[PDB]
């Protein structure tokens, strides 16, 4: 060629094989380093959780004996799931430009972390991967909604609601669009309800931390403490492999970069974790 | 409850409830409680009573609920009404049994409200266990906050 | 390369369960329809089952296979009366299913006679125990995805 | 033994005209094949290969590219489509192949994902990215293949 894909001609003007980084990440959805980690072995997961107890109740008249109870549990199965991303690379390109190589690894790692949060919440399962936690958990709490009350107000209002529930709350698990919209839909004052706009509040709401996970969906806010609700069992951890012994990459100069992890999910309280949908 | 003290001791079920000729898997149809041998009573002998949750086995047999560290077996869990016994709700094992979701009222450990399950040692207990499944239908009569038929 | 087998990536079509035999009626002592046999929605092994055959592991929920094949019990292998499954998970309609026990055509899974153990893909294969109870058609060597009349 | 002798059936169809605009021939221009590896079966019909690429040369032969073990060049780079006959019918192996430059119909035999295009010499894989289209939002790899161009 006379150029790589350049705009003008090198022959006319300009020389250099040194070039800056252009590659950049888009859409963060981390929650695995937030959660606790466990090792696991075995090729499938079975979990048991405790349901409500069957005790006696007396709403009227107390002198009798409550009916006894015994520890009753319900089952879940979780098959392994595989989370991955692949990159096709040209070594000649990589060696000449320079930063691409560093970008590929750090992107792959972020990318593995991103896909894992999406499948775990929900993001379309084919019955071959970990169960859809977001579906199973508690419906929309109509009580929080004071009727015609602001979106930002909803997120404040919900945080307290989880404390009444007696479930730990350290942090807000919201959707990126719901959070922006919540910030935008504030009263009649420049100052926001979480705290004024002369304080940093981009990454904190209600004075509690903000965890952005994608696929928690629009108009939904979920309070929890991440560590408590679920736990992350890891069958095998995130590892890169690189193959020039693969059939189609060998023939060519090309090298194939795989990034993958094989994961599983434990639910320590899938029978609780409060969520709400605005009706306002 | 009526003047000079309410209910006490055992209390009468429905007697001679005869269900027969069913096509499905129900316990209602005249069929046996089997542990092994050849059934019970001589002529002019009256049954006992036994309340709890029973589970359908191979063929047209029922036996008691056990563990949860072993497989769940047969359809719905049910409690025994009478049709051989002249006394209350219940039946003696090795008879034709009609069951119901009525077993009123012979006390035994815990209660049976909102379905019943089998626990991991083999006792009988009420729901809710699974919320993602439907367990044996034994919907009890009102009698709560006091010991009763499961 | 790379071929799914079971788990909702195989299409086994649909087959009619009101075809062959006597046909009972709608009644209780049934069990619930879901993916997984003790699992939860979107997490279940699956045979080459379509309509016909599903065995409880834990809870009173069904989806295909899974239960020791030394002893089959519960009244037949369970069949569907007057709803035909619209999935190919074996059964996983998402309703409470009323089941029967008349002679009724089923779909099988796994190579060889069921008299063995369970493979955790949703299949039967030969175990260390032989001359254990078989399912449906006998005298006839059954293979993976055979159509048996019970 | 193996197909590719006498008048034989077709994989890519027969006598296609008007199957491509500006990226493939619309007149019949077929010509005879000197073959590479076609895998376990001669002249295809199997997992591996399926009848590989030809590229036209001067004479009454068209012959192998031959790309090994599945490299590809994007846009046009010649694919073998339909066959013609004059003494024997069937796709390659000493019989007349009609080619195009990446036209239709292509219809090659695989297991699962990939598929893709086959050449002679190699196993059935599909080209990646920087070999076919890496235009807009696409997934293609060596694990991922479908019959047509990517």
């Amino acid at each position: 060629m006379s150029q790589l894909s350049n705009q003008e001609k090198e022959y006319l003007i300009s020389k250099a094989l040194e070039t800056e980084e252009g590659r950049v990440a888009l859409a963060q959805a981390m929650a695995n380093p937030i959660r606790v980690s466990l090792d696991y072995q075995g090729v499938g997961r079975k979990l048991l959780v405790v349901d409500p107890l069957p005790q006696g109740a007396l709403p009227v008249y107390d002198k009798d004996v409550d009916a006894k109870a015994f520890v009753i549990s319900k089952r879940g199965q979780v098959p392994d799931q595989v989370i991955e991303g692949d990159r096709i690379q040209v070594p000649t390109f990589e060696i000449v430009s320079y930063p691409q190589v560093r970008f590929s690894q750090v992107k792959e790692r972020r990318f593995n972390v991103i896909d894992r949060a999406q499948q775990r919440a929900k993001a379309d399962i084919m019955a071959v991967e970990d169960a859809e936690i977001f579906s199973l958990l508690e419906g929309a709490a109509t009580a929080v909604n004071a009727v015609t009350i602001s979106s930002g107000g909803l997120q404040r209002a919900a945080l307290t609601k989880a404390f009444q529930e007696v479930e730990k709350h350290d942090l807000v698990v919201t959707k990126i669009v719901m959070n922006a919209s919540a910030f935008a839909d504030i009263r009649a004052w420049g100052q926001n309800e979480f705290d004024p706009v002369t304080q940093h509040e981009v990454l904190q709401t209600g004075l509690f931390g903000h965890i952005w996970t994608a696929d928690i969906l629009i108009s939904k806010k979920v309070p929890q403490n991440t560590v408590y609700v679920l736990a992350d069992p890891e069958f095998v951890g995130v590892m890169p492999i690189r193959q020039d012994i693969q059939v189609i990459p060998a023939d060519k100069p090309e090298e194939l970069r795989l990034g993958w992890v094989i994961y599983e999910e434990l639910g320590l309280a899938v029978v609780n974790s409060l969520a709400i949908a605005k009706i306002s | 409850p009526y003047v000079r003290l309410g209910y006490e001791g055992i209390l009468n079920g429905a007697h001679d409830i005869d269900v027969a000729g069913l096509n499905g898997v129900e316990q209602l149809a005249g069929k046996f409680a089997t542990i092994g041998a050849n059934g019970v009573k001589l002529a002019g002998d009256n049954g006992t009573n036994a309340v709890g949750l029973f589970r359908e086995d191979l063929g047209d047999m029922v036996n008691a609920s056990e563990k949860a560290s072993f497989y769940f077996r047969g359809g719905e869990y049910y409690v025994n009404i009478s049709r051989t016994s002249l006394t209350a709700a219940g039946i003696a094992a090795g008879d034709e049994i009609t069951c119901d979701a009525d077993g009123k009222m012979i006390k035994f450990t815990g209660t049976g409200k909102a379905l019943g399950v089998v626990t991991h040692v083999g006792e009988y207990r009420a729901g809710n266990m699974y919320e993602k499944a439907t367990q044996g239908v034994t919907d009890t009569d009102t009698f709560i906050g006091f010991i009763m038929y499961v």
Side-chain angles (χ1 to χ4, degrees), chain A, chain B:
Chain A
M1 305 188 278
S2 292
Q3 37 63 68
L4 292 190
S5 52
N6 307 117
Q7 308 315 116
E8 303 318 315
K9 299 298 192 197
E10 316 196 309
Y11 284 105
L12 287 167
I13 187 138
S14 311
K15 307 293 165 308
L17 313 182
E18 275 196 290
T19 197
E20 309 193 67
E21 171 170 280
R23 302 180 173 182
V24 60
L26 187 49
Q28 320 309 294
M30 83 307 282
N32 319 126
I34 317 291
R35 285 170 185 163
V36 67
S37 43
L38 288 83
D39 202 354
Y40 207 80
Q41 283 303 112
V43 286
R45 155 68 82 163
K46 182 169 182 289
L47 50 89
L48 299 93
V49 293
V50 166
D51 306 315
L53 308 179
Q55 31 168 294
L58 290 162
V60 194
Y61 191 72
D62 293 344
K63 202 68 176 200
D64 297 33
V65 182
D66 298 346
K68 309 68 149 68
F70 194 84
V71 177
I72 56 174
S73 296
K74 66 195 224 295
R75 278 58 53 157
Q77 295 319 101
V78 147
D80 306 359
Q81 55 177 211
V82 189
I83 304 292
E84 75 309 295
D86 280 341
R87 307 187 59 131
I88 321 298
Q89 293 312 335
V90 169
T92 295
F93 186 79
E94 303 290 92
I95 296 165
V96 297
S97 301
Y98 304 106
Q100 312 293 259
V101 174
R102 320 185 318 114
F103 178 73
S104 293
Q105 307 319 105
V106 169
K107 177 65 168 48
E108 278 178 66
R109 298 298 84 101
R110 295 187 296 217
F111 193 75
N112 300 107
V113 155
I114 291 168
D115 309 349
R116 278 184 261 193
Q118 287 188 282
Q119 313 306 314
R120 281 172 65 71
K122 63 176 286 324
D124 307 14
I125 307 300
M126 302 301 256
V128 281
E129 301 186 287
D130 308 335
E132 298 190 343
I133 299 301
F134 187 35
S135 304
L136 312 187
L137 66 75
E138 308 185 278
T142 56
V144 176
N145 281 257
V147 189
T148 327
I149 196 265
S150 61
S151 299
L154 287 167
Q155 284 185 246
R156 293 173 62 261
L159 315 187
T160 51
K161 183 69 158 196
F163 285 134
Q164 301 171 191
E165 210 21 74
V166 188
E167 83 183 18
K168 282 164 48 49
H169 176 74
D170 289 349
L171 42 90
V172 214
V173 171
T174 327
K175 183 59 166 176
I176 186 296
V177 185
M178 177 61 189
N179 184 231
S181 305
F183 273 139
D185 187 347
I186 279 275
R187 50 189 179 131
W189 305 72
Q191 40 168 174
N192 293 3
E193 298 188 39
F194 309 111
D195 243 25
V197 290
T198 57
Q199 302 314 343
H200 177 74
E201 287 306 292
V202 183
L203 306 168
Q204 288 77 18
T205 53
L207 301 315
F208 288 94
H210 200 253
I211 305 304
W212 302 250
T213 294
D215 296 352
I216 303 293
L217 317 174
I218 320 186
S219 304
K220 307 292 283 69
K221 60 203 65 71
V222 194
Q224 55 174 80
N225 177 52
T226 27
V227 176
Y228 157 98
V229 176
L230 304 179
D232 291 9
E234 313 189 24
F235 179 50
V236 198
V238 81
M239 44 185 288
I241 288 294
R242 295 191 286 158
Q243 311 182 17
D244 308 31
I245 188 73
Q246 188 64 71
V247 174
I248 302 301
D251 302 344
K252 297 285 304 294
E254 295 173 61
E255 81 181 91
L256 166 59
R257 292 176 186 187
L258 313 94
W260 51 265
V261 56
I262 293 171
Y263 226 46
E264 295 198 281
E265 166 156 67
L266 181 48
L268 284 183
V270 286
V271 281
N272 298 87
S273 162
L274 159 82
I276 318 91
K278 51 161 184 183
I279 65 160
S280 300
Chain B
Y2 287 102
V3 299
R4 72 184 305 201
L5 195 56
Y7 51 85
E8 293 170 300
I10 70 175
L11 303 178
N12 296 303
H15 327 288
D16 297 336
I17 312 296
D18 287 344
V19 178
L22 300 184
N23 296 312
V25 210
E26 291 186 305
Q27 299 195 352
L28 281 67
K31 94 176 178 169
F32 318 133
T34 284
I35 49 184
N38 285 120
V40 304
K41 290 194 291 285
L42 311 168
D45 297 345
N46 191 50
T48 64
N49 298 302
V51 314
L53 306 163
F54 293 81
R55 303 195 296 188
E56 305 109 76
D57 304 359
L58 30 72
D60 84 330
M61 291 85 185
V62 300
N63 201 24
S65 318
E66 301 180 298
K67 307 167 179 83
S69 322
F70 187 53
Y71 60 60
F72 279 58
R73 66 169 179 220
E76 298 170 17
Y77 295 162
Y78 296 114
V79 57
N80 313 340
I81 203 55
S82 63
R83 60 183 302 188
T84 315
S85 307
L86 292 162
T87 49
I91 208 45
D95 302 345
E96 283 178 58
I97 315 175
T98 284
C99 287
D100 301 325
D102 300 356
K104 63 154 160 47
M105 178 287 304
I106 288 154
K107 44 185 60 51
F108 192 95
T109 51
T111 180
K113 55 193 208 163
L115 308 180
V117 295
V118 55
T119 59
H120 308 245
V121 303
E123 295 196 283
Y124 320 111
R125 271 309 193 284
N128 289 352
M129 188 197 257
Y130 293 82
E131 282 184 62
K132 304 300 173 310
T134 36
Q135 308 310 118
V137 184
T138 288
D139 309 328
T140 54
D141 295 298
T142 322
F143 282 110
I144 60 166
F146 179 48
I147 322 306
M148 61 179 277
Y149 77 86
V150 175

